[PDB]
Structure 1
């Protein structure tokens, strides 16, 4: 089994990559902007199943991790939650989030790398982690997921939505990302102290695309 070292360069390259990504919906999606509508439709449906009623997540506060300009906040979180906070390492995306989300400007915008971020203690009903876990190493993802657990209000949930490789991991040096497989991802979730409440595979995506999964964790 292969050993990969150079964490500092792994993170430094993701910053150089996102420095040239446009602060637009198309830049957030990559080469798959036509996939934003079915991505959003599936998230809204999956989310609703775990919110409202006794023992389910509340609707006061949500956290959008690796938010970018706030694509998930706009179409998924802001319609459901009274207040939504955004966390992203890129100041550029957080500034554009102000125009993209059409807010007065003007606290809800956190500029931190997730591996250096502690979600405020018991603040959130829902913590959303979409298309960003792949940018964290196995060690940093495990520690971040355990910290997200303490950021949860009573009956709060973490929603992890990402690419899940068929079998075997895929490392991409261009954007410094890892496409984990189901075995590796479930291990990290279990080790962080989280349990899977539910899971759904993203439908409506072309057969060529790597499978996309949704997990409800607590």
Structure 2
């Protein structure tokens, strides 16, 4: 780990108290940048398409949505592509609301896993795609390293991990109010490397305002 956190219990407890007050809505998941949900989803669809479907590329039977919240990414990115999707999130309230939010698309959701990711083992060799969006910043370096390694073991043959998150331009940003660390490129790539993953592709998110931290998508295996 680049940064050790002494007090991981207090760190993760504060994130829980934060998300208890987050509305279980698409706007709530977006943190009142609801206007960025559409360009986010449109870019995610195209990036997914690059790495899914075809010889050697990832299959389309099963995906895992990590830090799913109520399932915004499942609803508009994953469920239109995969035969079945599973959600994992630490907030039971978000997972329960996902059943209402997903409407008919929720009929293809096989499981709602209520776990914190640093305490979660993605089922062995089960997934064609594991999607990790806007939650990696909540894991400490040690825990993200470990979680990425376990995600790799959750992949079927030719499967991939897609990581989509804020990447600070320079250095990192520790946010004590929601227990998150926004990493820079060098830190994140180092952790990706040390987990045993290789970058199959990367893409900067377009259509976001300049006053936002950049967002990047990475395809890994």
Residue 25 and residue 156 in structure 1: after superposition, are their counterparts in 2 closer, same or farther (change >3 A)? same
- How many Å separate the matches in 2 of 1:103 and 1:176? 34
- How many Å separate the matches in 1 of 2:101 and 2:32? 20
TM-score by length of 1: 0.97
Aligned to 1:20: 21
Give yes or no for contact 2:79–2:105 (8 Å, CA) kept in 1.
no
Instruction: Let me know the Cα RMSD of the aligned residues.
Output: 1.4
Counterpart check, 1:117 vs 2:120: yes
Deviation of 1:108 after TM superposition, in Å, equals 1.2
- How many Å separate the matches in 2 of 1:113 and 1:104? 24
Give yes or no for contact 2:152–2:197 (8 Å, CA) kept in 1.
yes
Q: Where does the alignment leave 5 or more consecutive residues of structure 2 unmatched?
A: none
> Residue deviations 1:130-165, cap 9 Å, x none?
000000000000000000000000000000000000
Residue 123 and residue 209 in structure 1: after superposition, are their counterparts in 2 closer, same or farther (change >3 A)? same
- How many Å separate the matches in 1 of 2:159 and 2:218? 13
Give yes or no for contact 2:24–2:97 (8 Å, CA) kept in 1.
yes
Is the partner of 2:145 in helix, strand or coil? Answer: helix
Q: Where does the alignment leave 5 or more consecutive residues of structure 1 unmatched?
A: none
Q: How does 1:66-81 map to 2 (within 5 A)?
A: 66-81=67-82
Is the partner of 1:118 in helix, strand or coil? Answer: coil
Deviation of 1:31 after TM superposition, in Å, equals 2.1
Deviation of 1:204 after TM superposition, in Å, equals 0.2
> Residue deviations 1:171-195, cap 9 Å, x none?
0000100000000000000000000
> Residue deviations 1:32-91, cap 9 Å, x none?
010000000000000000011110000000000000000000000000000000000000
Aligned to 2:41: 40
